[PDB]
Amino acid sequence: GPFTLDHAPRITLRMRSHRVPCGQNTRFILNVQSKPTAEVKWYHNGVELQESSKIHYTNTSGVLTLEILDCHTDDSGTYRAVCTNYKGEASDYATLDVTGG
């Protein structure tokens, strides 16, 4: 059948928790495989993230990137990507530790 190969999102490359010196820009990367293609939502400490001068995420054929610019203490904490399709969901979280330069 046309929907036999449909499957819940599968994250094959997960985000890496990491440190960044205060003031630098930093990135999280993950890769999801999903049929049909999954909806993607980003969160910082539980609150859904939007594109802004501070936050830029991309999504190219499942390759997902989140950039945070000019990192300060407020930017520390948990970043979570949640990938959803009708078959199920996959979530990945990682921690950003903003440190001294």
Swiss-Prot record:
Question: Boundaries of each Ig-like domain copy?
Answer: 9-99
Q: In which tissues is it expressed?
A: Isoforms 3, 7 and 8 are expressed in cardiac muscle. Isoform 4 is expressed in vertebrate skeletal muscle. Isoform 6 is expressed in skeletal muscle (at protein level).
Question: Where does this protein reside within or beyond the cell?
Answer: Cytoplasm; Nucleus
Subunit relationships: Interacts with MYOM1, MYOM2, tropomyosin and myosin. Interacts with actin, primarily via the PEVK domains and with MYPN. Interacts with FHL2, NEB, CRYAB, LMNA/lamin-A and LMNB/lamin-B. Interacts with TCAP/telethonin and/or ANK1 isoform Mu17/ank1.5, via the first two N-terminal immunoglobulin domains. Interacts with TRIM63 and TRIM55, through several domains including immunoglobulin domains 141 and 142. Interacts with ANKRD1, ANKRD2 and ANKRD23, via the region between immunoglobulin domains 77 and 78 and interacts with CAPN3, via immunoglobulin domain 79.
Function, as annotated: Key component in the assembly and functioning of vertebrate striated muscles. By providing connections at the level of individual microfilaments, it contributes to the fine balance of forces between the two halves of the sarcomere. The size and extensibility of the cross-links are the main determinants of sarcomere extensibility properties of muscle. In non-muscle cells, seems to play a role in chromosome condensation and chromosome segregation during mitosis. Might link the lamina network to chromatin or nuclear actin, or both during interphase.
The extra comment attached to this record reads: In some isoforms, after the PEVK repeat region there is a long PEVK duplicated region. On account of this region, it has been very difficult to sequence the whole protein. The length of this region (ranging from 183 to 2174 residues), may be a key elastic element of titin.
- Family recorded in the similarity comment: Belongs to the protein kinase superfamily. CAMK Ser/Thr protein kinase family.
This protein is called what?
A: Titin
Span of the full-length protein shown?
Answer: 33294 to 33393 of 34350
